[PDB]
Amino acid sequence: GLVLDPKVGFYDKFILLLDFNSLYPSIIQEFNICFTTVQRVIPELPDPSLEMGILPREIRKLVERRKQVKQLMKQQDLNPDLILQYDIRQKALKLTANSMYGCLGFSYSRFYAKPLAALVTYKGREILMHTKEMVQKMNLEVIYGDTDSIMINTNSTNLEEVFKLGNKVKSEVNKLYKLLE
Amino acid sequence: EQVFHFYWLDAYEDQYNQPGVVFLFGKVWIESAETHVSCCVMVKNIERTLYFLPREMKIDLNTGKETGTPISMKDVYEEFDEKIATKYKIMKFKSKPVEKNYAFEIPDVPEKSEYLEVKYSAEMPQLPQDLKGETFSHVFGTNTSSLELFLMNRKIKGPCWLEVKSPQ
Amino acid sequence: METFDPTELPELLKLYYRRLFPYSQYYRWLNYGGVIKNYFQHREFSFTLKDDIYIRYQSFNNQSDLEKEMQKMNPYKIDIGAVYSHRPNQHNTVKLGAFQAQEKELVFDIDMTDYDDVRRCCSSADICPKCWTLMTMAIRIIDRALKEDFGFKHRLWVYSGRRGVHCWVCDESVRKLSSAVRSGIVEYLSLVKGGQDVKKKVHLSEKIHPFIRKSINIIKKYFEEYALVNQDILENKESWDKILALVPETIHDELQQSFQKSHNSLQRWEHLKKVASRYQNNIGPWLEWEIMLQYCFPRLDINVSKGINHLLKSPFSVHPKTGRISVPIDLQKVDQFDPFTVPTISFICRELDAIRTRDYKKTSLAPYVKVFEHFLENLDKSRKGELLK
Amino acid sequence: YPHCLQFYLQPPSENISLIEFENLAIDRVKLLKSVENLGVSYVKGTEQYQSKLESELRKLKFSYRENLEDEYEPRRRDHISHFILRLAYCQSEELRRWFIQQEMDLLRFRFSILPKDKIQDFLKDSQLQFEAISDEEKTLREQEIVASSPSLSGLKLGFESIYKIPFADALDLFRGRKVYLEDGFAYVPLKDIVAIILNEFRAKLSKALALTARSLPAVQSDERLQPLLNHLSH
Ligand SMILES: [Zn+2]
């Protein structure tokens, strides 16, 4: 993937992370990446108006089931043991999503798809890097990120202000890319 | 009729000791001890399954040049049942008309053609993966495992309680 | 003509498609000399079978298959698709997504459903020769426009059968046009802006395009004959209130008094012309010009032309309602062409029942068939020429 | 290198030293940044803009009418410098948009530089066909062109050249019914000609920059070009 050169130094201001997990599943949802969908023979992006393919079906099923479990954490007045069960199920769904891309790109795997994996990695690098320059635009500074986390310096000393800054950047990136979490 | 159920944890397959027999392992409830205790279960006659790809225009097997006649599922059926069966020691199988889909990277493969689902018991020797026929281009499922066929054709999604009838 | 009985269709269709249909002639028509590798093998055919059953994807290999499939099921309707990369009848056998149109025809449709607010003679689904003037002028205008503006040499119109016709402009470069090209062309040829039954649907500027000028020059040969004599649009207050709705209100009183003091649509229209000329001198908009454009100019449908895989009735078929045969339109005989003389399957079966397969010559289809061989002779001549040179 | 303007769609295959490589990279970066800043400060058509950017070109020797000096050094410099900027700029969509803006400014200025006599042979060298019409054809079809023309006031069809184009090349132009069509051929003034060519050029550059973005990971393995090509513009 793409690894940013670190702005090495001492940063006295607040530092908050941005976990780029489920990035590849989110991409596969968004651009409809599937074996039945891509016209491999360097591949090309499939048609957007085309029907939602196979891999998106199961990964979106997992994401929606995780979302409904997340709802079940909002409703209080539940047995704590069942709350722990819901948390375990949500975490399992998270890791299964994260490994979705794993099962497709490896010579170690059955479904080794060099072009499909290359397309997914290219899209991931592109979107993370776009987030990088635009968060530069929004008058902050980024110092490190490789497809699984983003280090962000704040230039601020108020924790709540930093948190709401993270919330606003999360919301804007979520409205820029629909299924990314 | 006596029936019982268990929670299956393990699934073992062997290709040479007891080929075609997957020893499913699991965790059974017993009424006599009013608890759960270890159980073994095994299933035989897990037939190997193949999917022959009939061609469209019969080519000469020696050179690949066209022989001037079309190809049908019936055509590949006889071609198999005499020559391939005699060469690789097959005496019984259940050829059926089955339509399946392929959407992977094996080159020159129709997406939704017709497949000759050749279902023969696993005792007969497994066919070579690069088998080619005068009538059929290639066949899938050569070494595809009895364990995965069991898991895949019995709709057993992960570890779930298994109901078994007529326990021999 | 006698009245048509729709219950004789199951036998009449079988007889016609057994004996009289120009199968191999249509075969050359869609084969186009077999220049492309499998242009006819990827040709799309669409049929409507018995009991309103619709089936879409068929591909055929030769005239033998065409004959067998046509005489085996006897569809009520024959419909045409496009030509794709692989065979449409096995389209599912090819990988998903790879299925894409690469060549297709460009078609233009004008129908009586487009003139419900225009015709004072017929209902939505009815026609008459005295309302056929609009269709004739539309044919002539589209003819000149495509033949000179774009040089479209192989223009073929086919009569739909009841309330409209279809065109078939079969140049090769036309066959390889892109969706954007066809769209840009259809908005290039669009002048009528059909809204939510807006009173005014045609407006112009001071500068006049030669396109519109030539179109109107053609139309003026028909306005007096049709709008003012065949339709007589200025016979009643309600009759000319539709025109007054387009005319500015400052002219309404003078038009009303002129029409009351007159007694016929011709006199009222010439008074309208005088008053409109006075208004133009005082102020131009060319009122006489947009009103006639809104009353006569063809009102097209965007989708049928813009679709790279749209479906439309084939020629030489039969109309399920009226039974008329979807025959080409003779480019030389347009001003006097009539839809009620178009052969009907009942009459042509009676001709066959009153009797190398050239039996159409003894049938009333014969002149229109010779029109079809004339068109395909033009196609063959152009193919041979622009291939050899 | 057959003509001064050139469309950049054939990468060079020569061998150059590292010092010349960096000199070209830095010089073209300076040229494009100057184009950006000058276009921001001034209006794109004023003689002050034209003369100032001409002086910038002369001090950076990137373009000039053909002579003994022009053939070898300057146009070759333009070629390799543009392609190394392609490598530098294909990283991001924002950088691609920036580069496209400045190169359109550059190419429009260069086209304004070229005298009217040589634009014919430039279009001929451009490998995509366009046919200029004769004076007799212009005089015969002047009334049609004016009647079907856009809001350009008056009947005046001045010295501006008119070309013959396949209709499929000017889709957005003719689809507004603001041009005359003759047997599937259009006739167009110079401003719309340059608009069409710049739109086509931006399409080709977008596709080529996307392709080079697909080619970046292989070409970045070198260690003597990574720390530059990461930061020519940034
Ligand atoms: Zn009528």
mmCIF file of N, CA and C in Angstrom, chain D residues 185-223:
data_model
loop_
_atom_site.group_PDB
_atom_site.id
_atom_site.type_symbol
_atom_site.label_atom_id
_atom_site.label_comp_id
_atom_site.label_asym_id
_atom_site.label_seq_id
_atom_site.Cartn_x
_atom_site.Cartn_y
_atom_site.Cartn_z
ATOM 1 N N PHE D 185 -20.503 17.332 -41.605
ATOM 2 C CA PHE D 185 -19.296 18.118 -41.389
ATOM 3 C C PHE D 185 -19.674 19.499 -40.878
ATOM 4 N N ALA D 186 -18.903 19.996 -39.913
ATOM 5 C CA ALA D 186 -19.170 21.270 -39.266
ATOM 6 C C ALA D 186 -18.162 22.323 -39.712
ATOM 7 N N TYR D 187 -18.491 23.581 -39.420
ATOM 8 C CA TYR D 187 -17.671 24.730 -39.798
ATOM 9 C C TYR D 187 -17.660 25.703 -38.625
ATOM 10 N N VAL D 188 -16.466 26.060 -38.158
ATOM 11 C CA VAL D 188 -16.300 26.583 -36.804
ATOM 12 C C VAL D 188 -15.264 27.704 -36.768
ATOM 13 N N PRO D 189 -15.437 28.724 -35.928
ATOM 14 C CA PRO D 189 -14.416 29.771 -35.781
ATOM 15 C C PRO D 189 -13.291 29.349 -34.835
ATOM 16 N N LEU D 190 -12.251 30.193 -34.799
ATOM 17 C CA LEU D 190 -10.984 29.833 -34.164
ATOM 18 C C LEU D 190 -11.127 29.629 -32.659
ATOM 19 N N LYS D 191 -11.933 30.461 -31.996
ATOM 20 C CA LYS D 191 -12.087 30.335 -30.549
ATOM 21 C C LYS D 191 -12.675 28.975 -30.194
ATOM 22 N N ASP D 192 -13.714 28.560 -30.914
ATOM 23 C CA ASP D 192 -14.286 27.247 -30.656
ATOM 24 C C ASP D 192 -13.343 26.131 -31.094
ATOM 25 N N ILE D 193 -12.530 26.362 -32.131
ATOM 26 C CA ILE D 193 -11.511 25.378 -32.502
ATOM 27 C C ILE D 193 -10.567 25.122 -31.333
ATOM 28 N N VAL D 194 -10.035 26.195 -30.744
ATOM 29 C CA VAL D 194 -9.076 26.024 -29.657
ATOM 30 C C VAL D 194 -9.767 25.448 -28.428
ATOM 31 N N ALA D 195 -11.037 25.802 -28.207
ATOM 32 C CA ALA D 195 -11.785 25.189 -27.114
ATOM 33 C C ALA D 195 -11.900 23.679 -27.308
ATOM 34 N N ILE D 196 -12.222 23.249 -28.530
ATOM 35 C CA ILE D 196 -12.355 21.822 -28.814
ATOM 36 C C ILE D 196 -11.027 21.112 -28.591
ATOM 37 N N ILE D 197 -9.938 21.696 -29.100
ATOM 38 C CA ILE D 197 -8.649 21.024 -28.981
ATOM 39 C C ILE D 197 -8.207 20.964 -27.524
ATOM 40 N N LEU D 198 -8.505 22.002 -26.733
ATOM 41 C CA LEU D 198 -8.110 21.957 -25.329
ATOM 42 C C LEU D 198 -8.948 20.948 -24.553
ATOM 43 N N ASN D 199 -10.235 20.805 -24.888
ATOM 44 C CA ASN D 199 -11.035 19.774 -24.228
ATOM 45 C C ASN D 199 -10.525 18.375 -24.562
ATOM 46 N N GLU D 200 -10.227 18.120 -25.838
ATOM 47 C CA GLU D 200 -9.668 16.820 -26.201
ATOM 48 C C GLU D 200 -8.332 16.586 -25.506
ATOM 49 N N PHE D 201 -7.501 17.627 -25.429
ATOM 50 C CA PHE D 201 -6.189 17.498 -24.816
ATOM 51 C C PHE D 201 -6.320 17.219 -23.322
ATOM 52 N N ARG D 202 -7.289 17.855 -22.656
ATOM 53 C CA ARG D 202 -7.511 17.573 -21.241
ATOM 54 C C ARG D 202 -8.015 16.151 -21.037
ATOM 55 N N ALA D 203 -8.838 15.642 -21.956
ATOM 56 C CA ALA D 203 -9.278 14.253 -21.845
ATOM 57 C C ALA D 203 -8.097 13.294 -21.954
ATOM 58 N N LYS D 204 -7.255 13.495 -22.972
ATOM 59 C CA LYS D 204 -6.096 12.623 -23.149
ATOM 60 C C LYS D 204 -5.139 12.721 -21.968
ATOM 61 N N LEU D 205 -4.900 13.936 -21.465
ATOM 62 C CA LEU D 205 -4.038 14.101 -20.298
ATOM 63 C C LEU D 205 -4.626 13.444 -19.059
ATOM 64 N N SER D 206 -5.942 13.531 -18.865
ATOM 65 C CA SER D 206 -6.549 12.860 -17.720
ATOM 66 C C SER D 206 -6.321 11.357 -17.793
ATOM 67 N N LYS D 207 -6.570 10.762 -18.964
ATOM 68 C CA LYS D 207 -6.360 9.323 -19.107
ATOM 69 C C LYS D 207 -4.890 8.953 -18.915
ATOM 70 N N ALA D 208 -3.985 9.725 -19.521
ATOM 71 C CA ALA D 208 -2.560 9.424 -19.420
ATOM 72 C C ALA D 208 -2.055 9.576 -17.991
ATOM 73 N N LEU D 209 -2.517 10.607 -17.281
ATOM 74 C CA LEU D 209 -2.100 10.804 -15.899
ATOM 75 C C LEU D 209 -2.636 9.699 -15.003
ATOM 76 N N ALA D 210 -3.864 9.239 -15.251
ATOM 77 C CA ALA D 210 -4.367 8.089 -14.507
ATOM 78 C C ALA D 210 -3.503 6.858 -14.761
ATOM 79 N N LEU D 211 -3.135 6.628 -16.025
ATOM 80 C CA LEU D 211 -2.299 5.475 -16.350
ATOM 81 C C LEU D 211 -0.933 5.569 -15.679
ATOM 82 N N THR D 212 -0.326 6.757 -15.685
ATOM 83 C CA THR D 212 0.958 6.935 -15.013
ATOM 84 C C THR D 212 0.822 6.766 -13.505
ATOM 85 N N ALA D 213 -0.313 7.185 -12.940
ATOM 86 C CA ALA D 213 -0.586 6.904 -11.535
ATOM 87 C C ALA D 213 -0.631 5.406 -11.283
ATOM 88 N N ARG D 214 -1.109 4.637 -12.265
ATOM 89 C CA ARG D 214 -1.018 3.184 -12.153
ATOM 90 C C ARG D 214 0.421 2.697 -12.294
ATOM 91 N N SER D 215 1.294 3.499 -12.905
ATOM 92 C CA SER D 215 2.672 3.090 -13.149
ATOM 93 C C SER D 215 3.658 3.639 -12.125
ATOM 94 N N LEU D 216 3.198 4.440 -11.165
ATOM 95 C CA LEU D 216 4.108 5.024 -10.180
ATOM 96 C C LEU D 216 4.827 3.982 -9.326
ATOM 97 N N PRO D 217 4.162 2.966 -8.753
ATOM 98 C CA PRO D 217 4.871 2.084 -7.807
ATOM 99 C C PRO D 217 6.089 1.387 -8.391
ATOM 100 N N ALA D 218 6.084 1.074 -9.687
ATOM 101 C CA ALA D 218 7.243 0.417 -10.282
ATOM 102 C C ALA D 218 8.404 1.389 -10.458
ATOM 103 N N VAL D 219 8.111 2.629 -10.862
ATOM 104 C CA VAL D 219 9.167 3.584 -11.195
ATOM 105 C C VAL D 219 9.727 4.321 -9.989
ATOM 106 N N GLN D 220 9.151 4.136 -8.803
ATOM 107 C CA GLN D 220 9.634 4.834 -7.617
ATOM 108 C C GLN D 220 10.691 4.051 -6.850
ATOM 109 N N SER D 221 11.065 2.859 -7.319
ATOM 110 C CA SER D 221 12.071 2.064 -6.623
ATOM 111 C C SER D 221 13.435 2.738 -6.609
ATOM 112 N N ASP D 222 13.707 3.614 -7.572
ATOM 113 C CA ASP D 222 14.983 4.312 -7.618
ATOM 114 C C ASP D 222 15.137 5.222 -6.405
ATOM 115 N N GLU D 223 16.369 5.324 -5.903
ATOM 116 C CA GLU D 223 16.653 6.131 -4.724
ATOM 117 C C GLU D 223 17.125 7.541 -5.047
#
